[PDB]
């Protein structure tokens, strides 16, 4: 996260670490058994840490658990990033608690114009690399469609929205990748990717989770 604040320990409780040795992606919990992250997220050996705040010290809160199976969208296309979103499974169900917390799926689709937290470990530089220990928080809007389709001629599809500033300096980045973007306490985003990391006129481009609900709640009911 570029030019975002530092959440407080605990205080964003379904943000989860996706950790193959090392942090590598964000995710949300979505119930006690299931994250959801992004496709490009994908890969073997991974372990769910729940409860994270400082991603270097064992602190308290924590829950590791490793996953038992990875589902990747059936439509996901790995070069244009459409239907950026898989389900992790885990292990063993987690304890829910104040500070390890599932985070509600939309109902609706949320317009441009309203406000979500963006969440994550990634850079938090725009241009260089240092990547926090501490999990950072951005307060961003839903950009308009056309607006995103203008910032990214050619790429933007009906299961992507863009959210930020246009003006750059605020956006999430490299390693911040399938963590949350909530809005009004519900998962309308997962970060996806962008040119760049709060550049002028290339905002984040996200999921669109509320296209993917039916296809969550079915997968989740047979597996
Ligand atoms: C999700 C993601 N991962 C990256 C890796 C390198 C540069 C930009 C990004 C982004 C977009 C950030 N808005
Ligand atoms: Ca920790």
Same mark, same amino acid.
């Given at each position: 996260?570029?030019? $975002? ?18 942090? =590598?992606?964000? $995710? ?36 590791? *658990?490793?996953? /038992?199976?990875? *589902? ?43 406000? @979500?937290?963006?969440?994550?470990? !990634? ?12 999990? #950072? ?16 001629? &050619? ?5 992507? =929205? @863009?959210?930020?500033?246009?003006? !750059?300096?605020?956006? /999430?980045?490299? !390693?911040?990748? &399938?963590?949350?973007?909530?809005? /009004?306490? #519900?998962?309308? &985003?997962?970060?996806?990717? &962008?040119?760049? @990391? ?11 989770? @509320? ?13």
């Amino acid at each position: 996260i570029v030019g $975002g604040y530092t959440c407080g320990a605990n205080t964003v409780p379904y943000q989860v670490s996706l950790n193959s040795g090392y942090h =590598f992606c964000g $995710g949300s919990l979505i119930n006690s058994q299931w994250v959801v992250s992004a496709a490009h997220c994908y890969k073997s050996g991974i372990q769910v840490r729940l409860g994270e705040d400082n991603i270097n010290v064992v602190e308290g809160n924590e829950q590791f *658990i490793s996953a /038992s199976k990875s *589902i990747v969208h059936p439509s996901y296309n790995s070069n244009t990033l459409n239907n950026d979103i898989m389900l992790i499974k885990l292990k063993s169900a987690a304890s829910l608690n104040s500070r390890v917390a599932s985070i509600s799926l939309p109902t609706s689709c949320a317009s441009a114009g309203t406000q @979500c937290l963006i969440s994550g470990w !990634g850079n938090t530089k725009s241009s260089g690399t240092s990547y926090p220990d501490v999990l #950072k928080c951005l307060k961003a809007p839903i950009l308009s469609d056309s607006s995103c389709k203008s910032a990214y001629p &050619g790429q933007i599809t009906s299961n992507m =929205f @863009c959210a930020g500033y246009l003006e !750059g300096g605020k956006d /999430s980045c490299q !390693g911040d990748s &399938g963590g949350p973007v909530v809005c /009004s306490g #519900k998962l309308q &985003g997962i970060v996806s990717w &962008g040119s760049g @990391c709060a550049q002028k006129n290339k905002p984040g481009v996200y999921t669109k989770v @509320c296209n993917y609900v039916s296809w969550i709640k079915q997968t989740i009911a047979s597996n």
